[PDB]
Amino acid sequence: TVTNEFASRFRTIVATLANVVNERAVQDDMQKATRSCTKQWLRHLETQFD
């Protein structure tokens, strides 16, 4: 396989699990900088798994 399969399934976990995190930063609505620095952490976390 060109790009490993097992890891590409993990990307779907992060893809939709992060969408759920937004609906809490709309009720508790924090400034962009806060909601961004968490959505940036899931990028690093996921790219390690690769």
Partner: protein, 50 residues
């Protein structure tokens, strides 16, 4: 092509993509011979964003 290894995550990592779009417009003769692997390091970019 001299291997350029990196993973696209930050929106600011467009520099490594724009580096080919610029190289392919100065030396179309030289880009026509290593279009092969310059492709697969860019095929990695397409799995991540789209």
């Amino acid at each position: 092509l001299k291997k350029i290894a990196e993973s696209f995550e930050d929106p600011s990592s467009i520099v490594v993509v724009l580096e080919f779009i610029l190289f392919a417009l100065f030396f179309p003769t030289e880009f026509n011979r290593i279009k092969g692997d310059i492709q697969n390091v860019l095929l990695l970019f397409f799995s991540r964003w789209y």
